Amino acid sequence: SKPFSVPVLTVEEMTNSRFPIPLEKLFTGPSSAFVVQPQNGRCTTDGVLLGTTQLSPVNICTFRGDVTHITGSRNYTMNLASQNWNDYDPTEEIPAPLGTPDFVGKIQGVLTQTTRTDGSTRGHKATVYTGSADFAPKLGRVQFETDTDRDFEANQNTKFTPVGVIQDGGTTHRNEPQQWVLPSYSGRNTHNVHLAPAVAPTFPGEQLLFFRSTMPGCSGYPNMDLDCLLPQEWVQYFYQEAAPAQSDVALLRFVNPDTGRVLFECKLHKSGYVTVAHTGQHDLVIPPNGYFRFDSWVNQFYTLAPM
Amino acid sequence: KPFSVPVLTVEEMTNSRFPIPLEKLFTGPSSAFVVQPQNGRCTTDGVLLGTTQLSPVNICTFRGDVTHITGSRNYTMNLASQNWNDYDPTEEIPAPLGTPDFVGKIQGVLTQTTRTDGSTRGHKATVYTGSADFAPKLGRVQFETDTDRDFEANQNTKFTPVGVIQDGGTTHRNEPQQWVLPSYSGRNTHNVHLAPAVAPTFPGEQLLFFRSTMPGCSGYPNMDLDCLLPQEWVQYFYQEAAPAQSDVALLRFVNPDTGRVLFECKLHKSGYVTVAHTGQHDLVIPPNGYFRFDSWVNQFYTLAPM
């Protein structure tokens, strides 16, 4: 039985699994008032990928395919391809193309295109509204609003690189993005399918532990806090190791290598999320060189030392 | 501890010189020019070299506060380290980790969040790594943007790379040059603490390159981007830290659908791969093929022709 373990990496050395940006800090908070069900950064401890989770960090919230537009519009419809530029399969038992955004918001990025005619290139500012009725990646279609009405060609490889999130600056619509609200992956009047399950602390006094990054904002006052259940490196590491789970709960200690002192302990659940013993919203204060260490498998009656 | 390389197909892995996925394998002659990239540099026992760091998303990014050049849409960025604490120029590395290791013009987005009340803004931005004012080792880089009024001073600012540009003409269609290092301290200075140049030493051998196509944002840039090791291999060696038992590790590229070996190659301790082939060649590989470490060999092992 191959022994289980987590990578020796500091928080800042790791990557958010829900947007291609580095981790910044750890956060814990109450989560009973809403549904926590992200589809990226979902992986079991024995290396089973869930939801829309794939291995590469750079591919989260990216799109590839060819685009079309009606005459003189700045809106382009992208017919999605799989990222290796082969055909996309809508029937495959997944919620949406692997790496698809798993929150409702406006993502701003750049739409680049290289034409096979002579190799010429071009890129323009583009925005995708993931809460739009016309956002249906599971059906293989998304729509971008851009800065051109003439420059992109049909039947040519086009890619979308995400940059950040936007907001109109006002107070009337200052509730976006909503990181815990999944899009309708197939468009209006449909239900999502093959979702990774929602998570919640069941043990009394416990809250989820979130790995937090700050999304860049390109305008106004967006919700830039972005929390994921596992760092992308853990997803990658579990997929590689595939160590059998000896129990439903793995005990992690967060250690400071400068002193060897344990700062806090936490539970890593088999299905792939972390909880701590704490009540209230809290930005954890951690030393620069700290990292997580797996110490043992425990039963389900283990009470964490308060954080 | 036994040495090994990850069970990952090429398409599942990431270029280590630009935040984009790998696409294919390429081999070619490299005696006519100097091969010395500083990103994706790692020894087999997990020691990072050059400007190489672990996260793929940080490659070719810049962080710091910006100042504005009057009578231009250009900004000077005073660099910070990735966690926004101060950057130390005295640290013995060629440049901040993740700094671009090629000469070309990179297009991306300059975003900023002001600490006064939290409002944000982003603008199209371009950095020329061959610029005289491109001096990352000194903690300064210069961006060209589409505004002259919108950014504020002493506020966290980030540059997100997207791709490379070229002016469309033939006169300057020689950029980017992926095998030409920038002058990290600005024009007419010498780089320091560089990871060494590599070359096949065994007769009949060529480097094996891990190739991606960079997004182009304008004109006809050089978009082929080759790295010596996948970012994941860097990540894996760093984690594994298996001591090298020899100077050369023999890898076989295997097709699991059939169990047959497609070709073999050398993975050198110093962190690069060579194959036995003469001439430029885009490798044809099965979708699920992967690399396998089979045994340590000496320096006199003759590879089966690829």
Epitope: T117, D118, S120 | F33, G168, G169, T170, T171, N174, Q177
Partner: antibody, heavy 116, light 107 residues
Framework: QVQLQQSGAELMKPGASVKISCTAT????????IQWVKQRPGHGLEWIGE????????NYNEKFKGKATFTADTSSNTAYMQLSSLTSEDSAIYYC?????????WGQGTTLTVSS | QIVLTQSPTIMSASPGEKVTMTCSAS?????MHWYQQKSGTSPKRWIY???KLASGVPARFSGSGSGTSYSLTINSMEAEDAATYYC?????????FGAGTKLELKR
């Protein structure tokens, strides 16, 4: 996808100036550079220069700086090259070309003959 | 300027022969490109970035080289291939072509 149409054959006396037309269809004209190339029977291909129509941007081969002038009429999608002070060594086939990375688009060519 | 010297200036081949023509540069270049031209028609970009094939170019063609020495190769000559081939360079302005290699057919 692109087509370049050039003006007809020209026959000029020495010392005159000729203006050759290159009309581009199939793309946004002011977005691509036009290259101009000279071809003499025993002298292979020679690059005159390039220009980006509607903008001031031009790059001349030093040998032709002062001989060839590039202008454009963007309304009409036409690029022009003017050659001044014609001598017999200007007798050649002249091409306009949109030269890309992987493929090109060349005009059909314009034959110029200079003679007394 | 970068002078490209092609060799041979003219040659002939039987259908099926292996054909090789070379380009030598006065200075180093990063990529070499090749053009095909037939009598009465404009030049067509044949090989670009040293080894990559342009549109419509048969798999029997190939290119190789680095620094100052490059070559174009046809593993099996066909009648369709009889034409004149020019090599071409971008590394230094001005852009330059070689004088050309005239390929004729044997019979």
């Amino acid at each position: 996808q692109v087509q370049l149409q050039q003006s007809g054959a020209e026959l000029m006396k020495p010392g005159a100036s000729v203006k050759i037309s290159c009309t581009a269809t199939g793309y946004t004209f002011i977005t691509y550079w036009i290259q101009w190339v000279k071809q003499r029977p025993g002298h292979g291909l020679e690059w005159i220069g390039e220009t980006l129509p509607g903008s001031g941007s031009t790059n001349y081969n030093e040998k032709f700086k002062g001989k060839a002038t590039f202008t454009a009429d963007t309304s009409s999608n036409t690029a022009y090259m003017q050659l001044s002070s014609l001598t017999s060594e200007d007798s050649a086939i002249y091409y306009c070309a949109r030269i890309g990375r992987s493929n090109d688009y060349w005009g059909q060519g314009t034959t110029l003959t200079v003679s007394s | 300027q970068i002078v490209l010297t092609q060799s041979p200036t003219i040659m002939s081949a039987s259908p099926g022969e292996k054909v090789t023509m070379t380009c030598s540069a006065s200075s180093s270049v990063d990529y070499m490109h090749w053009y095909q031209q037939k009598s009465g028609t404009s030049p067509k970009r044949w090989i670009y970035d040293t080894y990559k094939l342009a549109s419509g170019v048969p798999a029997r063609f190939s290119g190789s080289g680095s620094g100052t020495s490059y070559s174009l190769t046809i593993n099996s000559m066909e009648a369709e291939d009889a034409a004149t081939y020019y090599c071409q360079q971008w590394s230094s302005n001005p852009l330059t072509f070689g004088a050309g290699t005239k390929l004729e057919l044997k019979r």
